[PDB]
Design an enzyme around this catalytic site. Structure first.
Site, PDB file in Angstrom:
ATOM      1  N   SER A 262       0.981  -0.789   0.235  1.00  0.00           N
ATOM      2  CA  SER A 262      -0.225   0.139   0.136  1.00  0.00           C
ATOM      3  C   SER A 262       1.226   0.792   0.324  1.00  0.00           C
ATOM      4  O   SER A 262       2.761   0.878   0.613  1.00  0.00           O
ATOM      5  CB  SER A 262      -0.678   0.190   1.228  1.00  0.00           C
ATOM      6  OG  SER A 262      -1.984   0.776   1.169  1.00  0.00           O
TER       7      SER A 262
ATOM      8  N   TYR B 179      -4.323  11.434  -4.208  1.00  0.00           N
ATOM      9  CA  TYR B 179      -5.181  12.556  -3.701  1.00  0.00           C
ATOM     10  C   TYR B 179      -5.814  13.739  -4.100  1.00  0.00           C
ATOM     11  O   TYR B 179      -4.841  14.201  -5.186  1.00  0.00           O
ATOM     12  CB  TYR B 179      -4.255  13.529  -2.312  1.00  0.00           C
ATOM     13  CG  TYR B 179      -4.575  12.539  -1.362  1.00  0.00           C
ATOM     14  CD1 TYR B 179      -4.736  12.031  -0.368  1.00  0.00           C
ATOM     15  CD2 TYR B 179      -3.577  11.768  -0.817  1.00  0.00           C
ATOM     16  CE1 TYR B 179      -4.765  10.985   1.261  1.00  0.00           C
ATOM     17  CE2 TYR B 179      -3.029  11.266   0.821  1.00  0.00           C
ATOM     18  CZ  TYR B 179      -3.448  10.741   1.726  1.00  0.00           C
ATOM     19  OH  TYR B 179      -3.037   9.935   2.581  1.00  0.00           O
TER      20      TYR B 179
ATOM     21  N   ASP C 294     -10.414   8.387   2.794  1.00  0.00           N
ATOM     22  CA  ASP C 294     -10.488   8.660   4.027  1.00  0.00           C
ATOM     23  C   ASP C 294     -10.066   9.795   5.120  1.00  0.00           C
ATOM     24  O   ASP C 294      -9.274   9.310   6.143  1.00  0.00           O
ATOM     25  CB  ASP C 294     -10.464   6.231   4.267  1.00  0.00           C
ATOM     26  CG  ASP C 294      -8.821   6.769   4.058  1.00  0.00           C
ATOM     27  OD1 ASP C 294      -8.202   7.091   4.350  1.00  0.00           O
ATOM     28  OD2 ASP C 294      -8.366   5.425   4.250  1.00  0.00           O
TER      29      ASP C 294
ATOM     30  N   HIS D 149      -7.043   3.533   6.957  1.00  0.00           N
ATOM     31  CA  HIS D 149      -5.834   4.398   6.643  1.00  0.00           C
ATOM     32  C   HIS D 149      -4.869   3.595   7.745  1.00  0.00           C
ATOM     33  O   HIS D 149      -3.881   4.468   8.607  1.00  0.00           O
ATOM     34  CB  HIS D 149      -6.084   5.411   6.906  1.00  0.00           C
ATOM     35  CG  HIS D 149      -4.899   6.475   5.332  1.00  0.00           C
ATOM     36  ND1 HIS D 149      -5.378   6.504   4.575  1.00  0.00           N
ATOM     37  CD2 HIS D 149      -3.922   7.475   6.066  1.00  0.00           C
ATOM     38  CE1 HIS D 149      -3.940   7.611   4.078  1.00  0.00           C
ATOM     39  NE2 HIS D 149      -3.948   8.114   5.346  1.00  0.00           N
TER      40      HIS D 149
ATOM     41  N   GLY E  86      -4.377  -2.781   6.669  1.00  0.00           N
ATOM     42  CA  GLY E  86      -4.448  -2.742   7.422  1.00  0.00           C
ATOM     43  C   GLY E  86      -4.228  -4.175   8.205  1.00  0.00           C
ATOM     44  O   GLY E  86      -5.210  -5.124   9.067  1.00  0.00           O
TER      45      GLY E  86
ATOM     46  N   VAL F 262      -2.427  -6.528   8.908  1.00  0.00           N
ATOM     47  CA  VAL F 262      -1.747  -7.788   8.287  1.00  0.00           C
ATOM     48  C   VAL F 262      -0.265  -7.794   8.121  1.00  0.00           C
ATOM     49  O   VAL F 262       0.339  -6.537   7.781  1.00  0.00           O
ATOM     50  CB  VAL F 262      -2.414  -7.154   6.387  1.00  0.00           C
ATOM     51  CG1 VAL F 262      -1.659  -8.971   5.857  1.00  0.00           C
ATOM     52  CG2 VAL F 262      -3.550  -7.701   6.281  1.00  0.00           C
TER      53      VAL F 262
END
Ligand SMILES: Cc1cc2nc3c(=O)[nH]c(=O)nc-3n(C[C@H](O)[C@H](O)[C@H](O)COP(=O)(O)O)c2cc1C
Ligand SMILES: Cc1cc2nc3c(=O)[nH]c(=O)nc-3n(C[C@H](O)[C@H](O)[C@H](O)COP(=O)(O)O)c2cc1C
Ligand SMILES: Cc1cc2nc3c(=O)[nH]c(=O)nc-3n(C[C@H](O)[C@H](O)[C@H](O)COP(=O)(O)O)c2cc1C
Ligand SMILES: Cc1cc2nc3c(=O)[nH]c(=O)nc-3n(C[C@H](O)[C@H](O)[C@H](O)COP(=O)(O)O)c2cc1C
Ligand SMILES: O=C(O)C(=O)c1ccccc1
Ligand SMILES: O=C(O)C(=O)c1ccccc1
Ligand SMILES: O=C(O)C(=O)c1ccccc1
Ligand SMILES: O=C(O)C(=O)c1ccccc1
Lengths: 389, 392, 392, 389
Positions: C96, C155, C183, C254, C291, C293
């Site tokens: 990510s 963004y 988010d 996030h 998130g 992991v």
């Protein structure tokens, strides 16, 4: 690491070991073995897969089950013997396959396990590892009694030759059953080992199939137990191909982490076997986390025909040899006998589900993470104090 | 296993024990006792069976129950008296039987509890152990009030003559009930105690392991005394007891000293009583409860579920062991005051008003075992932090 | 806020960092990183929003799920490759986006992750942060393979010209998807970071707080690139996204850096997918997840519930920060190996075979908050004890 | 304790207090106040009833509730003001009745609370304790703005004289409402106080009744809020006698231990008010354990018309006076504004239940006690290490 502090080690086991009849729990063995074995004998025994949740959950899952004991029952006389797998046995438990017992017990190994299992009054069955530090034969005659039943666990090789020779060999040698481990097609990652030491074998075939088992039936009369089942759907399968029994096991939390606790699978699957007629057909054994007689009783109560313990008998043996193994046997026998009495039943056949409170079997919880700040600034209440002079 | 530590200890008993009026709660006696009892008096009082889970769980279960207090109620005046086994008592709790009180109060033992109970303005039933240091003779003569009530805890010997003699002896001496303990056919394995010294053995003549329903039925014929079966751990045996027509039952697992993984009595209570209505044996059998009771709100919950009274062991043991008889009274006093205040704030004024409408029972069964956690994830995780103060 | 500690630190980076082959698991990079990153590189990587609960809960949720492994299956050969957003990838996980990779890898930053990913026999998609130290130009030129795939995390600026320019720029540079982050309309309050320096401020021009469904619908017209809405926290917004016909969605909060008490993405996943069948939008929208992991069994659970791929942030950050590019590869390698072994033992051989029949979902919702416990009861309680070893 | 280590104390608060704009949380105030106040100012503030479970559970119960946030919502502009009790207010929170603020703030007390509440941009309501260290009047003019709304909480006396004079007195003095505490007929036992210091008053009437309230309606036009409700059955009652509002409160975990968490009662009772038409009729406030904007948002989301915080504003005031109280106000305002934005709504009226995940509200658990022995001998996995030179 190995470090002239195996000098601190040899201090401890030297006489500093408490008198064998000062041992109360199976935990006491484990503490003592923790301090004494070589860093790598210890890593190899204690170790579990990855983060070790299943290894621990195996044990803790017994604690989700409580008792509804009968009182005002004559329990002067209690009998804990039962039948497993043709033979009739003194206890409802057994030693399970631990590999490599010469790391812990250098001279005698899994010979001293066989001593332990029928050297005293009570006579317990013994599974023998395919990775035994001893030969099947070395072990079997180190046995002090022809009454003590033995069992062979088997990694089928990729050479269906070598494993055909072994089945014929062990038959010829006494063993009353065959336990085919199926939960280790790839050996599980045990990081306690690796950290200090700084996953397919041919010894163990990952090609292994149901059909391969069906075939192992024909090539032998020895009863066959598919050791390593982890869901109901495959217990049913073992029944469907009429094997003798099955061990609900996840290799001691050493193969797949987040495998469930055998005790919880057990409780799921025995109702499903009545609801499909298959009750009579299959012996359903259970290992993992079993450390007390009340654990052993929960299993039996739920349906287990017998319950295996690995690490504890290693740890006792590793510390006090065959004598360790016996005391550990008697320890567990006494735990089972007392809790039966307090349970208010007198034979293993009366150990049923109506003795267990199962209302919270499924309360396997993960709490939300702790409010660090709130709890750091909180001050608890305080106990009253004492004074001055 | 004691070691001219006796002086380290005697030095604390010594005037270091704080004044009795400085005791706020029952947990204080327990602490003071932990530092001053002899190593094996402490092991014998404090200990429970094996891994000790039931013992702890007996308490914690109280904490899966919460309150639904009634507000805007005239709670000026509050009556904590009720009736047990046909006597009327000042208080809805009792001192359960506890063997060997001299280990911690060598001079007076059970006699001092008997005085603690009967001496003050508030007086409390005393169950007397079959294996008490003192004689029933001695403990009954020790009582300060005629009005104070004392019960007898019976272990039936396997020589039922000895037992027949005992029952006869104690009804002559004026005890008001027989609490026959049925949760000890084999004596529970308490390992803190064993760890100090260094299966047919944990059986014995003195407590008959063959005691049966048929026996209790016969016990009932041989005596005018109300009979309570002490040590019931499931609703099935409360019904069996209502059926032989006995006066009552203690839901109890012996303060967690016999069978580990016996349920919390409060939990058995809460499932038991509703069934006792469903088969209208409601007021045919008085159901007592013990184990892990340490606060007056603990007592209230059991009363609100329908217990007739709730018993306490170790706390009275510890209070008697530090402060002898005025210890015992202080605990009665402390626990009484707890029950009164909590009653006001709960919105009721009598014991009969303590019903289930006041309890929040929804999370009673959230007996959890969490999944083992992630020693590595938590190891490297660093938590937030408070701000600091500068430098000097 | 750094203090000629740089030497204490440099001394550890110094040859004290163990060999890369000594790294067993992802938690090791995280530890090594905690001791060697600069005080505020560490605060910026490691931190989450406010009390930090979602951040931790993202992980722990994985642990309310268990396995139902299939035994006696030919698991000789195992294929962990699958397809994401129209490319075919080696591996069912991705890196990510993570802003400011130079704080911890000052020389190469994101370029080193791009190499870690595309260099080895096993190659892994890289999402690139809109606010990465390096240029997309620089990070794309850094890629070792044509076959390796890189996505763009967008963004949208509140000056939609800047944004139109950016999208155009990055499809020219050959990125394979746009992950538009939704988010962060306001930038989450991460207090370890703030605690070092010493509401319209936590808003900003650079991330437009008015971004709307209608905007994304227009974004979709202006580009040929598949669009993924990154940062969805409820099933309601997965449906909204299936409706504007976007390529996919990351269930994500996030890394726990925005809104505390956002649910664990794995939990949203597990309720979301069944609904995605009930309205046959099943294979109309690829659902990713991120998130917390950290293990290959974590990845497996998300794949078994139906995620198309699962993302990791901090672990690749920490690996890149200690070992730069061969760090990144090692983690890919480590996590890959975890997924393979766990697949064998689970009893499946491909990613398509990873379905819900393999998960035990029954205790997924046992997100508990226990009742505060009894500091006093536990204070005076003394636990059992192990036996000892004698004296010398 | 009091001990010329109020010399160590005066060290700390002297300049050693960090710059007021280094404070991030409400917890930061609490840590700082913990170290500085007198042992007995601290006991009196932090203290809860008995074992303090309710005091803590009040807070932790917010953590059983999670969010289902909307994304792709224009949140450039957010508005957190709303209406409580006639007036219209800047925030959805308020200072609640803390007694005796001269222990923490010696010179200025609950005057400095009134400063704090409208001395800066945002203007927060203030409940005034009947046990105020200041007079109602002292406070009300220490206020820097006629816009800042005030509220009087009231212990009805047993002399229905004295309390009739007070209601008429406070009316005359500005206060826009009356908050009648009803959860302290007997003052709760706070053992932190007692341990250091080594339960009916007339100040507070335990005779208090519903009928007594019905009567307090007639003798005044001030809106009336029965502060201290702890079940749904009595919210309904307050509606049935048409009082203005009600605070779901258990006096800060200071009266009855094992009272439930207001947030959990809230969630139970608002559905019951729709199911009985009574939604419009009653303002339902909420205090206890509220320490973050996400807490405040859960309450509002569930139905709370406004949410009170006690101890935090004490702790800020106790440390930094009126300025402390304001920063603490702004701190909480910013927390509320951000989480709204991230929640994806722009007014308090859009804060509804469909924003909350309530599936685990009722997971108030007590775990079975820890297996001491099993866990003592267990060794966890270990992180990789670093080296030598
Ligand atoms: C040291 C070690 C070695 C083992 N080797 C084998 C083996 O070769 N084959 C097998 O089927 N199980 C093996 N097991 C697992 C057991 O037979 C048993 O399933 C496990 O120990 C049960 O769990 P417990 O130790 O918690 O009782 C081994 C276990 C340990 C701890
Ligand atoms: C030191 C000790 C001795 C006990 N002796 C007896 C006894 O002789 N007979 C009996 O019926 N119960 C006996 N009990 C059990 C209690 O009467 C009671 O059920 C227990 O103390 C309740 O638990 P608690 O200590 O948590 O309150 C004993 C308990 C303790 C702790
Ligand atoms: C240091 C840091 C920076 C991040 N920067 C971005 C970013 O610029 N854009 C974005 O869309 N996500 C960003 N994320 C979020 C991640 O892409 C990802 O969702 C998160 O790392 C997943 O959680 P994990 O770290 O537990 O794996 C960032 C995360 C971290 C930890
Ligand atoms: C120090 C102290 C004194 C209090 N005095 C009163 C009082 O006189 N009247 C009242 O109604 N509440 C009183 N309260 C309670 C509050 O008004 C409020 O209900 C409580 O503080 C809410 O909980 P919290 O502190 O966790 O926010 C007091 C609270 C504290 C902590
Ligand atoms: O240690 C083990 O778990 C095991 O099963 C094993 C199997 C074969 C060889 C060595 C160990
Ligand atoms: O110690 C005990 O719990 C107990 O009840 C007892 C019973 C008989 C003999 C000794 C102790
Ligand atoms: O730090 C972050 O999480 C992040 O995503 C970010 C986004 C924009 C600017 C800076 C950081
Ligand atoms: O401190 C308190 O909780 C309280 O409510 C109070 C009430 C009256 C007088 C003093 C304190």
């Amino acid at each position: 690491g190995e470090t002239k502090e195996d000098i601190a080690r040899k201090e401890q086991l030297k006489s500093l070991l408490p008198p064998l009849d000062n041992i109360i729990n199976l935990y006491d063995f484990e503490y003592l073995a923790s301090q004494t074995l070589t860093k790598q004998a210890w890593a190899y025994y204690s170790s579990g897969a990855n983060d070790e949740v299943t290894h621990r959950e195996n044990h803790n899952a017994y604690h989700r089950i409580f008792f509804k004991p009968k009182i005002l029952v004559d329990v002067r006389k209690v009998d804990i013997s039962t039948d497993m797998l043709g033979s009739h046995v003194d206890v409802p438990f057994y030693v399970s396959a631990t590999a490599l017992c010469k790391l812990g017990n250098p001279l005698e190994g899994e010979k001293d396990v066989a001593r332990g299992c029928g050297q005293g009054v009570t006579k317990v069955p013994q599974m023998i590892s395919t990775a035994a530090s001893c030969s099947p034969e070395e072990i079997i005659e180190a046995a002090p009694s022809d009454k003590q039943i033995q069992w062979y666990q088997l990694y089928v090789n990729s050479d269906r030759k070598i494993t055909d020779d072994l089945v014929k060999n062990v038959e010829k040698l006494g063993v009353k059953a065959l336990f085919v481990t199926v939960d280790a097609p790839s050996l599980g990652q045990r990081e306690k080992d690796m950290k200090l030491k700084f996953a397919l074998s041919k010894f163990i075939d990952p090609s292994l199939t149901w059909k391969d088992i069906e075939e192992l039936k024909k090539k032998t009369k020895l009863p066959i137990v598919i050791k390593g089942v982890q869901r109901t759907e495959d217990v049913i399968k073992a029944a469907e191909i009429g094997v003798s029994g099955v061990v609900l096991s996840n290799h001691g939390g050493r193969q797949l982490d987040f495998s469930r606790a055998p005790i919880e699978v057990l409780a799921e699957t025995m109702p499903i076997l009545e609801q499909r007629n298959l009750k009579d057909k299959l012996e359903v054994f259970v290992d993992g986390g079993v450390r007390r007689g009340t654990d052993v009783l929960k299993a039996l109560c739920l349906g287990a025909k017998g319950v295996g313990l690995g690490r504890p008998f290693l740890y006792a043996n590793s510390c006090y040899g065959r004598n360790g193994v016996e005391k550990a046997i008697e320890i567990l026998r006494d735990e089972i006998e007392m809790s039966m009495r307090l349970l208010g039943v007198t034979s293993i056949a009366e150990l049923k589900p109506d003795l267990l409170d199962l209302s919270t079997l499924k309360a396997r919880t993960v709490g939300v993470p702790n409010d660090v700040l709130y709890n750091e600034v909180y001050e608890g209440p305080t106990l009253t104090e004492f004074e001055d002079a």
